[PDB]
Design a binder for this molecule. Sequence first.
Ligand SMILES: *[C@@H]1O[C@H](CO)[C@@H](O[C@@H]2O[C@H](CO)[C@@H](O[C@@H]3O[C@H](CO)[C@@H](O)[C@H](O)[C@@H]3O)[C@H](O)[C@H]2NC(C)=O)[C@H](O)[C@H]1NC(C)=O
Lengths: 185, 186, 186, 185, 186, 185, 142, 144, 142, 144, 144, 142
Amino acid sequence: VTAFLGERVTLTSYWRRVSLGPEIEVSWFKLGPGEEQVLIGRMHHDVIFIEWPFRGFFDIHRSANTFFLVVTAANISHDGNYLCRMKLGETEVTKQEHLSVVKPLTLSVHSERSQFPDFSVLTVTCTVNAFPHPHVQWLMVMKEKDGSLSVAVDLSLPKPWHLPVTCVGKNDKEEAHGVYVSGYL
Amino acid sequence: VTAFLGERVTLTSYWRRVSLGPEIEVSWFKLGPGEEQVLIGRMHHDVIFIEWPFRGFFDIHRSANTFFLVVTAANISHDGNYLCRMKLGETEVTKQEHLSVVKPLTLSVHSERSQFPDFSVLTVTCTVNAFPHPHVQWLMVMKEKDGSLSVAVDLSLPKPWHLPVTCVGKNDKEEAHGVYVSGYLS
Amino acid sequence: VTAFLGERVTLTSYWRRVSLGPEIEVSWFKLGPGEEQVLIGRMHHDVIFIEWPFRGFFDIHRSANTFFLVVTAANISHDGNYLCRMKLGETEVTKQEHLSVVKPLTLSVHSERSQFPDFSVLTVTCTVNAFPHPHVQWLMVMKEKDGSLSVAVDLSLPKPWHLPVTCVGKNDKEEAHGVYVSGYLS
Amino acid sequence: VTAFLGERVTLTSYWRRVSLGPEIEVSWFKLGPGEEQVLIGRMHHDVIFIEWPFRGFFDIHRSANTFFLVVTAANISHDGNYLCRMKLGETEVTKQEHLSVVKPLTLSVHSERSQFPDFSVLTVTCTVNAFPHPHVQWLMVMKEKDGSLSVAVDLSLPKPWHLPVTCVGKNDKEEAHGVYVSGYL
Amino acid sequence: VTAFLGERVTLTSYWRRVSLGPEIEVSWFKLGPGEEQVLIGRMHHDVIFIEWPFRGFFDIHRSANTFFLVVTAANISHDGNYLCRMKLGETEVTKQEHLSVVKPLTLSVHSERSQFPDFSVLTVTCTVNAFPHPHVQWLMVMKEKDGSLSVAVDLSLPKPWHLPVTCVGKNDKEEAHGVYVSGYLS
Amino acid sequence: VTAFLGERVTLTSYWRRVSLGPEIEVSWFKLGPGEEQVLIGRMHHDVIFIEWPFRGFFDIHRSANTFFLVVTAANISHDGNYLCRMKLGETEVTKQEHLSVVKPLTLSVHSERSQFPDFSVLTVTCTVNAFPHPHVQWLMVMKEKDGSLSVAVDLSLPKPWHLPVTCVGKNDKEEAHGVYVSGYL
Amino acid sequence: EHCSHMIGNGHLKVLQQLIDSQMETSCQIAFEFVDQEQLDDPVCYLKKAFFLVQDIIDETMRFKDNTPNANATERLQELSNNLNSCFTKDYEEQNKACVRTFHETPLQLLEKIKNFFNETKNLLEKDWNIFTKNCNNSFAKC
Amino acid sequence: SEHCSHMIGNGHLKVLQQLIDSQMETSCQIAFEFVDQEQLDDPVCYLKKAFFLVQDIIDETMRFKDNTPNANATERLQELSNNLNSCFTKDYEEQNKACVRTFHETPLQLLEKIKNFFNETKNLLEKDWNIFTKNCNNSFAKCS
Amino acid sequence: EHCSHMIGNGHLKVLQQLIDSQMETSCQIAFEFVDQEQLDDPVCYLKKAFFLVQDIIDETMRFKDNTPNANATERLQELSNNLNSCFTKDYEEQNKACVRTFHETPLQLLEKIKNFFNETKNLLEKDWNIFTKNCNNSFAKC
Amino acid sequence: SEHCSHMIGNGHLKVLQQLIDSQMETSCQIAFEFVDQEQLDDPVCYLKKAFFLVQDIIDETMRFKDNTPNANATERLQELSNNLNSCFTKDYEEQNKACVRTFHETPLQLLEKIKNFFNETKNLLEKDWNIFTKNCNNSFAKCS
Amino acid sequence: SEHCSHMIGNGHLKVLQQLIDSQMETSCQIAFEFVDQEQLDDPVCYLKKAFFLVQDIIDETMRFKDNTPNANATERLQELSNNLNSCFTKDYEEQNKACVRTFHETPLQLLEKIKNFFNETKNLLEKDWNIFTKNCNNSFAKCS
Amino acid sequence: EHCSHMIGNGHLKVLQQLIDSQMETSCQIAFEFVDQEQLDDPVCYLKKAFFLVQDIIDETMRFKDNTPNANATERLQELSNNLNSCFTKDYEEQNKACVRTFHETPLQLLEKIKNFFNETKNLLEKDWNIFTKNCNNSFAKC
Ligand SMILES: *[C@@H]1O[C@H](CO)[C@@H](O[C@@H]2O[C@H](CO)[C@@H](O[C@@H]3O[C@H](CO)[C@@H](O)[C@H](O)[C@@H]3O)[C@H](O)[C@H]2NC(C)=O)[C@H](O)[C@H]1NC(C)=O
């Protein structure tokens, strides 16, 4: 399933037999690289306890045979795989879900003229900050503190400047365009 | 004259009589508001002295009858009028120059979908940072630390999203466009 | 309802008619002083949105006709009255709940001997940090950053020290004792 | 000899022959581990000079054949062994004293109920902060910035809670008790 | 009595009758402006207690009938009058002592040549930091964090530089000289 | 050539043939140790561009066949060797200049009396802070944050104090004197 | 006096059939009912329960029109209406006292209803004037 | 077998419809696996896939008190399901749990899906008792 | 009418000699002259140029007293004074319009002067009334 | 050779003085290498050193349009310089560019230096045509 | 020896008491080693231990100008001490400086301790001149 | 005139015995006495010293009642009282002038007293009118 940065999101799991709900010992995990398992929180007989690290970012609640892991507000770190382990007595089941967080792309265009050897070469810059897969290309990678990815491409234009000029930025299926039309001079 | 943010720029003045150069007591000034005159630096017999406030930002040098005021790197504060006073004995001449600094506009577009009561209202944002006169408009003001000006406009789109949508940003005669084409999901 | 500092707690409300759940426009509120109403969050058709101030501290979720307001971790500020308003069309019902937060009292005893004019006067100190109503007493108020309340009492004992000595600390119905038995030297 | 944290304290040394006082070249040392000797200060003919590190914390003064090392205010670092060297011409004597600093114990009791799997297990905590030898035990180690030692012990009580419950804290010969009587509920 | 900055110093008082020492209730004071009396510390039966403000800066100790007030390290604040009150029963005697602290003067000389309109005017600077009474003079006031006083004087010399040139600095009876002899270039 | 700390200074280079000026591709370098070359700035056809590191500290301008490198305000780091490379087509010339920065010496005298074993030994201190070569000597090295050099010498005087006493400080050819005349007592 | 035989086994049978036909699930619903912890007296417990059962029947037990269970619920509602005359009024203070919120399975709720009707039936047969009893004390104890 | 044409009777659909109507209407939603229409639209292959999921749901989900009328209805349907197994040919095991989604819906809606399955299956069997011999490997593979 | 022959080749020769005798250097001087980019009309270009040439001659072309070139400059100055009567006044608005600052070699400046006198000479010979022309438009265009 | 006495004529000094006067007076300053008087005061050795620098300056600095009167003057002076080479004896190559400084002055001032050189050289040659056989290794070495 | 009974005479105690009275009263306190009563209470063993400490104190502490009446008194007492050595039996060397404390008191108080020692010792010797043959290894060992 | 023989050797002997009987120690006491550095004139030195010796004798030299030294101190005190008539008054300004605080051994203090009595004795024997001398100058010098 998929959700945007900051938004509330809910991953789900359930017990096959519809008769049982509270009886199930549910426990959620955040899958770091190497299929590592970090305990998020546990639930049993409607007694919930989230590990302090995830307290306030994650919560668990139930309805019938269904178990919900609620991310209060998604940030980039959360993108990845999550695992739900449900146990009844000796029997236990593992169900897996993949949460994709997305940051709406931010395309930005800005230009500058060369300062040497002359002032004839105008270089325009197209910059897209998105997640998880930003992409910029002119028509004919840095990591931010928020955890997103910024990428930019530059284009040089010798006089006469063949304007207008267009750059395509996109984030997987998301897409947007930028066009430099005219200089000051 | 005109120059872009950060660039090296040179304003000029000269003595009518070509015979003389070093002999002239040259002095440059920054015209603050109210026709105020702030001394930048002085020159005489190839002895130059810039006032400490402007030291490193401005320099003066000479060639023959010509006198140059060099801004090492132009910042927004420098935009305005400058005055050169040149003196020989009792006689003095004044020349005035106007430096327009410009910051190449920076247009940026980015969107977000409503989180309540549903996820159907897509709001796009168009943002332009320029100088001296930024302007943004959808096709249906804050001051920065750099001294530039940022201005932005927002547009709400109920489903179905009538994309693509275009915003026009411009800095006087400079102009550029931003277009949101498609969302991630729809 | 009642809960201890830090613990997860759930207040509940429901719709009289069991047939309906998602259709109800639920909205929870924090009753500040003066019967002020602060919006915590809203829910409709299983679309939840918590106001940014309370984001991460509160959450809302549903099961059938029941609506739950979950405090992820209770802090002293949360103690007070909460209100749930549930609306179907023109009709609306209001339910009120009272959450009492409690901080388990922390009694602490420690002594020091006078440094002048002699070392004969032993003064013991009894300190209780609790919430909402701490109380200390010898058997013959400061506010903390956590929002709790600390209060303390001192007792002077001239030689011979009539030990042991006992202080009673308590938080309403909760209660605990501290007893100084012997000094290091005598 | 012994003294409490912050208090003024005086270690003493003397010259065997009572006839002499000022003539003696006195010098005090603080004994770090390995019988290492750190110079505190010197005295001769009532001319005193404390090394700058100890200036304001230590002072030296004399009376007759007796020499006093005065600690203005004792802190935990001062606990240890001190050495006085007294020299007359070629002859020299070393006398040794042991200063024990003490921090009056601070006993503290506080409880919490389990958050999982139920709210039936009440765990009480008994905490004693003292020096040099804190000790806690229920009846049937961390170092602080001040240099003292904190130690604590926990006790779990399943329902029904067998209250009251008592913990004994003590600092060598010093002793104090804590009793949890009743919960809120 | 007099002492230099940082040094250990001892003011003294005593009981007339030599028979008695510990029995006397001794107490020392700092005389602030307005004949104000600030308690430094007390002593009785060889039980000493310094007030926390002065703790570590002052100490009291005894020998026979004599009582010593020891300043561990003198700083400028300490300069002034001190008072010792000694009491036996109803009778009490007061002794007064005056501690003058001194900071050895620090004379410093350094020059720079004019940068405009030419490099012909050499200006030398003479600076004295002392206490309590610094004074500087050319042979033709700021307060420091240490509590000392700095004062300085400047002298301009047009070419030809009539060197050598001498400045006299002094702190009351203390005195020292600084002489600029030659520049780097000439 | 030579200049004092903070002052404006100009190093020069030129093209042998007087006919040409703008045509020459001039480029200045700051010579770090090991004859290393750090690019300061370039000039061609009166188009100047200073590298950002040196921007505001250095500038380049021209007059006829002459090329000037202007240091707006000299600081100690600038002391060293500079190199000008001038290129016309295939031919290129290298000219070398040495800029000596100087800090006017600062001589300072101050005294203290011994605190042990008596107060009879008066030690006076003579301190000179200069650049590039400070020197202090009594008549019968630390580096500062500004980049200058401080050096000091001490002289002990047993009672009776043989005053007055004189110290000579100097910075190569620059020179100045200090004389301690009398103590307070 | 007719209160003795107002409740028939036809009603308890239809009720039990209704119960058995419900699918067993984990999902829990919320409803108000008598707190046994605060009210143990059988007579007063049932007396208090009666009105709560009326409300639950009215607003909770919903079935598609003209279904056998829908008609069952109709019969039971009518029965409740006729039973109104067999319970005497106590006080208005006590309404919403001795009452708690329950979060349980529909099956458990229906079981509570069944127990009510059964025990109510028995006690009425023993003494048709049993529910004239004054329960102000039993209620106030809560 | 040709008998597949008439294996399903209106008696089964009747007990099924009765079972549906007797259920109490609530807000509570349950989770269960069923065929995703978005990825699998072919009527024949849709039902073929649905059949086994219906088997499982009937077995583990539709639980009633023993010997209850609805309990017996479910027994009849389970038996019916067992007899129908011989009318569906095996495809591949790779595809089981493919073209399959998690549903969070009311019990009534689930039961409606079941009813719809039996109804349309009944019709198609009557039209051509060999309809479910079809190879749906492609239709199944289309799912992602 | 005498304007036709006011400028003689003796003047252009003395001017060219003056030019050739100057040493070639890199050093550049500053002076005001007509901007070709804004004013291309030959007649109006020369018309505007005339006055600027007067000023440059007066204040720029300096030689040691009684040197051949000093006398050359004198002759040219006189020539300029006699030429005053051949150019008609236009407007005062336009003075300092169509004019830019030039930073060029002395040789290039003297070349500009030469071109002026040469072309002016030619056009005068063709039509001695050529410089009565109204150039207000050509000037305003700048 | 004894002819060195009269190699330089007033005709050369005349064309030179004319060249000077014909130059336009300006503020602009140019850079060139010449003898530092501060380090080299001996008249004879000063001129000897100056001679070669004058050769170079004449060659690369004093540029005029081809076939111009001044151009021809410079040619005459260059020829004269070539003939004078035989009147100066070689000293050492170490010292070339020693006792030499960079000058930033007006063209007129440079030309004045040249004129002064030829004048004083002319006089001294007339006094003693063997004056420039002198060994100036010491005078040159004195420079630092 | 039996003579230990009468070795100490009232003449010694007399010169001692005189010495005490002739001392000027002051506040000044001096430091000296003596028997800690808190750790050693047994009269016999207390005195036995005290004896040697008294020897040392007499030798190094009680200093007077040569040939002074008190100087001679101290000489007599020192001689007396030397003669008394034969009346005390050796115990162990481990215990010397054990049961011993540092005292900071007035000279008068020290002299009082000395006087008390000689007095009680005198009495006990008169009672039993063999009293100080006692083994005090235990009493000494008790000290910590 | 009797001042000549007021002080006897019986007094100096008793004083010296008193001195010798004191135990030698390191402990130092504080007392006011004449500063030799500021007052060197023998006559005026002794003259000033006399009164300070009176006070020291009174408050410092303490012995147990009826001890030989106690009686010695009594004799000396009486002697001091009789001596009062042999010293003439100077000025009250000078009291506490030429006087410093001394921190020395008791023995050194007693030595100072001895020296006083001895030299005072000698000078009185030489000239019993010696201490009528005016010492205002010697005192003011301090
Ligand atoms: C106890 O819980 C309450 C919530 O009931 C916490 O109050 C919240 O505290 C946060 C952090 O201080 C506040 O957010 C802040 O907002 C400002 C902008 O106004 C922003 O610049 C900060 O970065 C920060 O995000 C929030 O306003 C506040 N919410 C409410 C409704 O008061 C409180 O912090 C908790 N107390 C303790 C001691 O943890």
